[PDB]
Amino acid sequence: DKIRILWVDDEIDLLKPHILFLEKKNYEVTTSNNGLDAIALFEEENFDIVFLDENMPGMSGLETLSEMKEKKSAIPMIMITKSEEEYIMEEAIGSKIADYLIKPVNPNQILLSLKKNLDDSRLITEKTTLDYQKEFRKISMELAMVNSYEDWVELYKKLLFWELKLEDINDQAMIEILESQKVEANSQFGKYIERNYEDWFAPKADKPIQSHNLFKELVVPEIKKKDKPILFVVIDNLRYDQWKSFETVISNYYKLEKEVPYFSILPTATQYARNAIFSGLMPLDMEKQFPQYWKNDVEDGGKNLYEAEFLSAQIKRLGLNIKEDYFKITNYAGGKKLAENFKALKGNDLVTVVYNFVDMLSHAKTEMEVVKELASDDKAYRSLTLSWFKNSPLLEIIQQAQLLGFKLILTTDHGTINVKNPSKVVGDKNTSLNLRYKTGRSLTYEQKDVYVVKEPKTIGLPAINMSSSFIFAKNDFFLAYVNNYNHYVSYYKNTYQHGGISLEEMIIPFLVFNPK
Amino acid sequence: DKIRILWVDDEIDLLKPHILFLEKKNYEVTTSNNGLDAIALFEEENFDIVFLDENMPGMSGLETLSEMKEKKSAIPMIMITKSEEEYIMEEAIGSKIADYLIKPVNPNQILLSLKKNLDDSRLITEKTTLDYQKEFRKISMELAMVNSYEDWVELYKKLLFWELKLEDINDQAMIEILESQKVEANSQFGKYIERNYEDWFAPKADKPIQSHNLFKELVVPEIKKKDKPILFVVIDNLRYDQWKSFETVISNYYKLEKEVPYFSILPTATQYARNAIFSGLMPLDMEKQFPQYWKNDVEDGGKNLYEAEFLSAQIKRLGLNIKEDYFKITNYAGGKKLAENFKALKGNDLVTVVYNFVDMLSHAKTEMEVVKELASDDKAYRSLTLSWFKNSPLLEIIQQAQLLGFKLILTTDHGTINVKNPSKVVGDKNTSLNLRYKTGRSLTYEQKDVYVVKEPKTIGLPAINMSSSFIFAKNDFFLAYVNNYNHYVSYYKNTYQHGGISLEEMIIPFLVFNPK
Ligand SMILES: [Mg+2]
Ligand SMILES: [Mg+2]
């Protein structure tokens, strides 16, 4: 099976040197000197690729292209033309041409196009495979050598780079090697946090940017430039790899200006971390300064009701004098309504949007078999996230914002992790259920599995009484009650949970973009 | 905001004519003469794109590329080099280069690369929009000019071509124009079937290939070539557009040899149409010849239990002497098990796999808000299907089959349609609750909404008595019982159902592929 090329050109006899060149490289070329007969040939025969000129007496190559793609849209098509006109370039690109080569053409430039457009998947798979064999050892080495939070960020970015490259490989041996490096990463990172998290709360401490610092340290510098209105979107419960999975979709509308990885406070829970973003305060100080807004034990509905109030209070405290609105999207319909009415916010200095879709999807994975099959592993969950995003009102909002010349800031409260191993726990139940952190007056737990803080106020968290403590799951543990243990294990094994310590949960993107 | 180019080349002074050219076109170029300095610049500054030569004293461009992509993988990178070596070409392509231009390079070839890699999304949107304005009238005209089943097939393929192209459009006014052309198409197509379906059962009638013809007419010619073993996959309940949505994924492993649109029998239901594929018989003749296998009144689990038996009987009747096995996958775990054990089927002439995923996903949309948000429209359902497929055991099975040099045949029983408008119905308490067809001895219905067949034996369907009849929903109607009406209507409105007449349900792909 030689690769079969259909070349359409009214002057095809002048390109016979190119045809001989390709035929010596095991390509079979069929020629046509008009579009009509070329289309007929293309319907009847199976060609791997088509080359087209633009200028033909009968019908333009661009017309021929549109007709051919209607008949078989999966066939790559390359324009080989004398035309250097920007309008023709744009027409070709807009018609989903694979490449556009300007005559006179180096035969090897044509060969390149053939390899780039027919063999890329194979070449990338081969290259990625061979590279990761050489690189997996270096990553383990670097992982063993990590002794700073900045180094943890850098390592995490290396892991993610490779995790994404490996998702277009079929070899399971290699994928398991990476899954094991992630496990080792989280183990070592868990210990790092256990040893350093408390010191970060000492005065004048060297510490990463965290939830309660975020708005003041990273958003306000963008506001104070006073060059553009800002859409500040907090996508609830987004992992760094989920961001990566739709980075390229966003890059069509927005150019990245700044990317700062930052750290969620503990617990890595929406009620604590996300409220902290908006308040600019640790949860202890939200309880002290806003007792009417802050909730400790609460049912699932009522954890993040006062974010607008928190944010406006912070904006006042920082003495910004800005037109600013807050919206929380909790469903499709609300999303649509904001995309439809977004024009009305042109006058604003700041529009802040919380987008809840994740944590309804993570919940769905626990409850139904189909969502489990769609999110079987992290690769699938990334795929499913990308699908959601591509077809979400959130992307429509971003599109709107770009048309109105808004700056886009994109971040999240905290990520999630696939939990695998149950760790036993006893203690009177909280109203809302979390599987990676607990707070209580009499908590029983396996100490090896959890970071324990016996004096919560030292890390900016509320204490119910003098005895109270917090525990945070490490690794991929989930905290299972001893009563009902077997059903807890069956239900929640291999679900996405949050609240504890992992790279996925704790290290998260903050992203600034300018519209294109 | 000029577009910012970083150009790395030890001989950058020789490229000053190119830089002047680009600077007149509103590009800003920053130059570097070695990879190290270039990497430093790339970390510090935000470049839209990077140009690299290969041959440099310090570092290979290929090395520089790998370093840069690790730091920011979303930035396109173009190699501009004297090198015509296939290994360098392949390394660049394998490293995810965006384009590879061979010096000396026409400045306009560079301009093309810039536009293709930075502006394609916009250019495609603009071109698709402008093209559909010019085409929408011609589509309506083509719909008016339909006088044959072949014409219906061609029209359906035109509609699908445009529906997918308009996926890349934000303008809703134009999308609604197309949705309305589809509605008119289904209206007219419903009437076509109403007028022609019975006459198609006369021999000597000009008729499309249908379920009961499929295996004999289209699979057996491939078996009788005796050149390769065949994996015959029936993806349960797949629409043509769902196939289109993952056509390119499959094209990495398999080259399309043949595509025949064919027509599902009525009802467009798995119990009738899929059993007919395997039996080679209409349901009436399955009842007569295989009473033990055919079931009229059966639970949803008991509808397609005897497909292996039907198929082996057909293979015998056609006097083929082939090693043939059948598998029905009903869950992830079963899918995995077959992909893991596929090597063991090396000797087989035919492997037949029924893959049930899609019917469960449509039920999920009905029962859960999250699936509804992920499949809000047909575009989202296509996106969600693509995601499933990319991460499915079915693709693993296909991959295995390709490694073993199997020919791939891909088809489906019938599609599904988003139902919108209830049509009232009484009677027909059949065990399973299908929403687009009913059979019973005394049916009350709105006759405008349904194709009615008073004597089922005339269209190859079973009749409980001479009073029995069948009804098939047209357009986007669903059959709603009068009892509990309001809750029935809320539950099933905007769900994917099947059993009736539409382009989506009835016209479906049969696809033959050779392995790559
Ligand atoms: Mg010409
Ligand atoms: Mg050089």
Numbering used by the authors:
A (entry chain B), B (entry chain A): 2 to 517
Per the authors:
Here, we report on the structural determination of PorX, a noncanonical RR that comprises a classic REC domain and an additional enzymatic effector domain that exhibits phosphodiesterase activity. Our crystal structures reveal that the PorXFJ adopts a two-domain dimeric fold with a classical RR receiver domain's fold and a unique alkaline phosphatase superfamily (APS) domain connected by a helical linker region. Each PorXFJ monomer adopts a two-lobed fold containing an N-terminal receiver (REC) domain (residues 1–120), followed by a three-helix bundle (THB) domain (residues 121–209) and a C-terminal APS domain (residues 210–517).
The primitive orthorhombic crystal form gave rise to a single dimeric assembly (two monomers in the asymmetric unit), while the primitive monoclinic crystal form gave rise to two identical dimeric assemblies (four monomers in the asymmetric unit). In addition, in the primitive monoclinic crystal form, spherical densities, in dimensions suitable to accommodate sulfate ion (mimicking phosphate ion) originating from the crystallization condition, were clearly observed in the REC domain phosphorylation site. Moreover, in one of the monomers of the primitive monoclinic crystal form, residues 358–369 were flexible and their backbone could not be traced in the density map, while in the other monomers they adopted a helical conformation, further establishing the dynamic nature of this area of the protein. In support of this notion, in the primitive monoclinic crystal form, two phospho-mimicking sulfate ions were identified and modeled at PorXFJ's APS binding cavity. These findings further suggest that PorXFJ's potential ligand might not only be large but also include polyphosphate moieties such as cyclic di-nucleotides or polynucleotides.
